[PDB]
Design a binder for this molecule. Sequence first.
Ligand SMILES: COc1ccc(S(=O)(=O)N(CC(N)=O)c2ccc(N(CC(N)=O)S(=O)(=O)c3ccc(N)cc3)c3ccccc23)cc1
Length: 286
Amino acid sequence: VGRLIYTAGGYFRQSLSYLEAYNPSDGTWLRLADLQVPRSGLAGCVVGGLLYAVGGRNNSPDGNTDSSALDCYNPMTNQWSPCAPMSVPRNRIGVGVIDGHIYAVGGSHGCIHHNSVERYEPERDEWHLVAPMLTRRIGVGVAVLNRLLYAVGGFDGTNRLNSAECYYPERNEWRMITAMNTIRSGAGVCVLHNCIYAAGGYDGQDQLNSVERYDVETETWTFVAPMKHRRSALGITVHQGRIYVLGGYDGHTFLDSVECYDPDTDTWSEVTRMTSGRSGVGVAVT
Ligand SMILES: COc1ccc(S(=O)(=O)N(CC(N)=O)c2ccc(N(CC(N)=O)S(=O)(=O)c3ccc(N)cc3)c3ccccc23)cc1
């Protein structure tokens, strides 16, 4: 009877179709309607209390194909419903919500490394392209803060990135903001109390466990306590003023651990474990 952390899809051995939700007050997991097609490297977001699944890579009998798909899940009806697909496929995608619109940002088609972002209008059920990013980004993290969209880290097709750019919908243009002190692709990026948090990811050498935040007051990146477990391609969300990071890859095993970050005490604790270790999930809280 509360807001829940949903995790859709993921990977373990092959692409996953699970939808599950976690209740933080009683620490319990719920099993909900599976995705109609299994996907990993998708992103999740919530608009108008609906759960949208964006992008990822399909796994199917035809083959493993990068997805263009947008699908919408209603917690009241426990039902998945297809919507209009994006202009292009996008694996390793990031998404953010501004003014009840979904921004699909970056991602990979084959090895087209996208730098185009498109915006979906739920009422109209339409996707319309907007200004493309300055940089090509896949495995990119996205965050919205004061109606400004941030794309953080990723891989441009040749380099792993520590830059981050910020989108002013007002002007429909992108500007580069201060780079992170760490190169992160596949990171977890969320907003919490006027900070963007980039957590884990891959710097090109090893999977990361460090966490840094961009304080927009200072437009500079600080380090904070690190996670207990290295993890790349994690899912991240914020719930009741704490950060949650779910699963991911450590270079060795597919994590099932869920860690919770208290900004007040600047510490991480492991609050639970998922039912199955996985990575590349989409996460949203409604
Ligand atoms: C073989 O073992 C597996 C390890 C992970 C998975 S996955 O389910 O999580 N998955 C599914 C997909 N490709 O769609 C993904 C894989 C790699 C990514 N990165 C590349 C990027 N950002 O471009 S990475 O930086 O995080 C990274 C780099 C190197 C290593 N060794 C590990 C991770 C992803 C980034 C965002 C979302 C998903 C990603 C499946 C098998």
